[PDB]
């Protein structure tokens, strides 16, 4: 019927002055643009159909051609920034915003999707969609007593569009826009659908990836507790965006980081630091390094939750990048920790793994390791046990590693390397 139409035939039918013939050609185009592979987006654009599709968006009398052109334009806008730009250049943004108020829910949902594709292109298209006034109508669609009264697909699409309105930086979404959507995003973050929960966590992760003022707007909304609950989830698609948002919040103030700790976050890291997904281990280890850069009571919280042996494990065996984050966590712990905490680290077995990572090619990981070694040695001086730490480093072979670091390409590496060798390994 309308399958496998030539763009020429689609152009012939759309250029008819027969609304029904245009609907047939607009549906044939949607099918071409909805096929499994190689949607001829460029061919559709060059035929000059985007303007016709945007004009069809306004056919209140022909809701079919409104839905057909919505889908075609959605899939065009799904492509490169060039093709999205073509859709936006056709005056599609205001037309889709108008369709958001359609009584046909599939037409409304298609407009939601199209706006999601536009806004997801980048920060400029995101702010342009916002300026055209899409937040009010989009949030009006979710103004129900129970979101469970909404179609699973409808809800998922609205959440994914809202996540795209909270995504992208340079600049971050307008503060007013984030404050107008944050309340509805918190309700979707408490929804029961795994896809709505992951997209909501990804929206919250986008909002928390910026200055401490942004982190505060989200933390003030009181989402950290549900984020920690979603951090425990069995779905990696939900645990991934949850850990990122928690990590983003622990990049902020020590009070924002203490809000995470109070919510029970540290109790999930035993699993996140042993998680089979390398990306989860890395991000958890980077959240731990930012937690050990905090106050001493916060380091003591880390210690009380048994997380130091887990950092030792990660430093002993884990993806190099995870190990680099772990070396950072150790250097932060030892820079800000009490002498009692620093000694707890060496009792947990941090010396051998740390000294074994000194044989790494990365120069920055060696500088970070040498930094922690010096901080622990400084704590050892306070106890008069530096000799025992020197004996521990010489036994694990790390003394040889430092000795060789004295000929390293970097100045700081051999500079700090020679200092410790002529400070705790000299007569």
């Amino acid at each position: 019927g309308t399958v496998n139409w030539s763009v020429e035939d689609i152009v012939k039918g759309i250029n008819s002055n027969n609304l029904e013939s245009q609907l047939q050609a607009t549906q044939a185009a949607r099918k071409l643009l909805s096929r499994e592979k190689q949607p001829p987006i460029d061919n559709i654009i060059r035929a000059g159909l985007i303007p016709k599709f945007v004009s069809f968006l306004g056919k209140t009398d022909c809701s079919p051609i409104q839905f057909e052109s919505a889908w075609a334009l959605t899939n065009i806008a799904s492509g490169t920034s060039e093709q999205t730009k073509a859709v936006v250049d056709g005056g599609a943004i205001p037309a889709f915003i108008s369709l958001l108020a359609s009584p046909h829910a599939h037409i409304s949902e298609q407009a939601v999707w199209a706006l999601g594709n536009i806004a997801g292109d980048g920060s400029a298209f995101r702010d342009l969609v916002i300026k055209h006034g899409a937040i009010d109508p989009l949030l009006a669609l979710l103004a129900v007593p129970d979101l469970s009264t909404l179609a699973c697909g409808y809800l998922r699409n609205l959440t994914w569009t809202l996540s795209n309105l909270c995504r992208n930086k340079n600049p971050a979404p307008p503060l007013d826009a984030v404050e107008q959507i944050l309340p509805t995003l918190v309700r979707l973050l408490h929804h029961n659908d795994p896809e709505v929960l992951a997209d909501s966590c990804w929206a919250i992760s986008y909002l928390t990836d910026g200055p401490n003022e942004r982190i505060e707007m989200v933390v003030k909304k009181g989402v950290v507790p549900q984020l920690v609950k979603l951090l425990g989830a069995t779905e990696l698609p939900i645990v991934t965006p949850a850990l990122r948002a928690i990590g983003n919040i622990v990049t902020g103030t020590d009070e924002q980081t203490q809000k995470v700790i109070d919510a029970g976050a540290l109790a999930v890291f035993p699993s996140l630091l042993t998680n089979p997904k390398t990306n989860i281990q890395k991000e958890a280890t980077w959240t731990m390094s930012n937690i050990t850069a905090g106050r001493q009571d916060q380091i003591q919280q880390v210690v009380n939750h048994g997380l130091v042996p887990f950092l030792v494990g990660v430093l002993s065996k884990a993806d190099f990048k995870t190990q680099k984050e772990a070396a950072w966590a150790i250097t932060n712990y030892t820079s800000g920790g009490t002498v009692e905490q620093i000694v707890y680290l060496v009792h947990c077995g941090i010396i051998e793994p740390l000294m074994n990572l000194l044989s790494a090619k990365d120069t920055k990981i060696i500088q970070v390791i040498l930094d922690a070694i010096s901080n622990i040695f400084q704590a050892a001086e306070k106890l008069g046990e530096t000799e025992k730490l020197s004996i521990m480093i010489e036994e694990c072979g790390g003394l040889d590693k430092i000795e060789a670091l004295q000929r390293h390409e970097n100045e700081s590496v051999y500079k700090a390397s020679l200092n410790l060798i002529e400070k705790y390994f000299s007569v």
Binding site: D209, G247, N248, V250, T251, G252, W286, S289, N290, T292, A293, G294, W328, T331, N332, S335, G336
Partner: peptide, 5 residues
């Protein structure tokens, strides 16, 4: 010592 994305 806090490092951001």
């Amino acid at each position: 010592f806090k490092r951001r994305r």
